[PDB]
RNA sequence: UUUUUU
RNA sequence: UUUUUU
RNA sequence: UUUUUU
């Protein structure tokens, strides 16, 4: 085969290419430090490296009740073994301040300082299970960016305050403290991985806080990655006989950029619990899925999802790519009203049972035609308002 | 054979003609050695030979936390290992000063004068990721040149800027400490290599230096290697049935080219993951693929893929092939519509069916030509602008 | 089988007349004459009655 | 010598 | 680089 | 997020 060389270093084998180790610590009083680190975080001070450590030890003080030695044999350090990452139990006698836990060297020397001069509060009332949670709530819409997820994180607050589930600390729902959360939760890797093992792991007995964060998690699914769904649910559309292509994708040069997709997605498959968060996660093959690499096979495949629904004409592109997927939008509109009467007729119906679900398809034309337009206005409205 | 001398010397078996040794050290402030050595690069002298030294030390202290016993044991080392490049392991107590790293000999007692001039600055915030992060921004679109190099460094600092990923120092994103980063890793090889490995190796557990040299990496592939990219996907296109060759390369004086071309990229293969890395490492035999060798292949090749799409319109090529490239473009235009009104009559669709399709058809060659011209203009622009 | 075929042409953002014109010299010269005119936005006949 | 977009 | 609704 | 009656 002489055109595998395209596909040279894309599906390469698990090899382990690092080594990183950090510090969990068997203590007495895991609530107070927890604390402590829950109030670190709403200072606002940069972790430089403890911050793995401090988050690894916040989520092991809420699944484990705060003893390392259970953590490193679940399944979670077993997975990121594997990958070079490990954990070090370190005993502890008296921790009376957060930074007798802090080692010896130049970083540590330089945070020191900082975490010397808070004043900490000896009282506090917030455990690692509401910090876990208000993190988890960024998941979803993590990677379109700030304005997004803090959006989202407010609807969310909503959203579970009403349902009688959680209050949170006021001064956590302050556009600034949200800011360094995200800061927080977007450069660090192993926190977004134990939520979302946590998460989508726990088959049953949900606290309060693991129901958020499995909510949390579920919602989080193939965010950032609208072209899987989109491309898998219309354009290599799968019947009952096989994989059917659809008419809109059977232009010479679509098919070369699908074979590819195919071959990326047989990658991307590798990771089978966690590809639905490869973007999120930033797993091996995801640059490999992007709107650029197939420009005009995520324009039609985004057109011919828009046609169906009401919501995903909310959807932004680039500057590029607006034409060819009204085009596809509009194609795949009139393909669909062909496709609905020669169904409808071929269906064993009576006279009346025709003009019944006729009627019916009708009005449910107009809702979705009414529905996409009132969406289209309040995205044009959105990005208009945003540019003043 | 009697012609098998035309090919004599061009595969050629693996064989070690070198003996490299570089000096890694193991010592406890490595993370002070390494700012010092960021800092050696942001005044911009020269290193002469621990240049390779100090950025695989620069390497190991990101990758596996700054020990090289555990580098030694790693598969890039081992892959070095066989090309006659070994590293050496070398114990230190004090360091104060960077210089006493340096060995004794001419060179080195040359450059101990330099680094004995600068003012080290006691405390500094800049870990060996960022610096690698920022050096592997430089990778793709580095075989073109100064101008696309830093015009490309730009465009991806707003781009990981805005994705809320990192923030550069300011003193980084001025043209001289662009320029001098160019130097350094132009000429070096290890650093690049290091880089590669790493970015196409690791997967999963990316930090945000890791996710940014991933996906650099995965930027950079075939880069320097367009030629290879558009014959492999439209001259010896690979059908179903076999490899069809293209109307437009039955010419016999592009047979012979193209029987060439094929032993070119057999030699090219030899090299499994890195032979999309080819002219950027400089590998084996990346001189034998080369537009000059195969002058109206390539420019066939260039026209029949600028026909598909519409960003490979601003490609420059010399002044001997642009009317060839034209007139394969043209030609191949005409074809394409050809082929695609033969296929549209072919396929099993209605009336309405075949209208939907057809006006999405002429949509999208429209589409298709605007933003061609648009591209066209653009790369005018662009060169006319150069020149003033 | 008079030797006479039509063309179908499609054509979305028909502002003026002038772009249903092709290019070539002939075109190129009613172009001309064509933007000139002071075209009614609103008129009303019909196909049918010339 | 490379030249686009990602 | 991502862009919707959940 | 759920929304009725039992």
Known sequence: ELHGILS???????????KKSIPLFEIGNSDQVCN?????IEAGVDLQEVAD???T????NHAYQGDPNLFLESPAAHYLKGHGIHFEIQHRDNVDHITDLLGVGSRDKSLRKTLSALEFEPGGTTTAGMFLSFASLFLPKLVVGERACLEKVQRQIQIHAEQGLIQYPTQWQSVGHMMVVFRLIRVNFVLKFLLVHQGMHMMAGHDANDAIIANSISQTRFSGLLIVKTVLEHILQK??????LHPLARTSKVKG??????SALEALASHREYAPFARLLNLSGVNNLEHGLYPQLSAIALGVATAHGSTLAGVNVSEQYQQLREAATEAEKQLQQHSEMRELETLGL??????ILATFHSRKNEINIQQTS???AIRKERLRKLTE
């Open 8 to 18: 040279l270093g894309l599906n390469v084998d698990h090899t382990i290419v690092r």
């Open 53 to 55: 450590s401090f988050l």
């Open 57 to 60: 030890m916040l989520c092991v």
């Open 36 to 40: 402590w680190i829950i109030q670190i």
């Open 239 to 244: 019947t009952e006989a096989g994989v059917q």
């Open 350 to 355: 009576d006279e009346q049972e025709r003009k």
């Open 374 to 376: 009132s969406i289209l």
């Open 257 to 262: 950029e699908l074979l590819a997709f195919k």
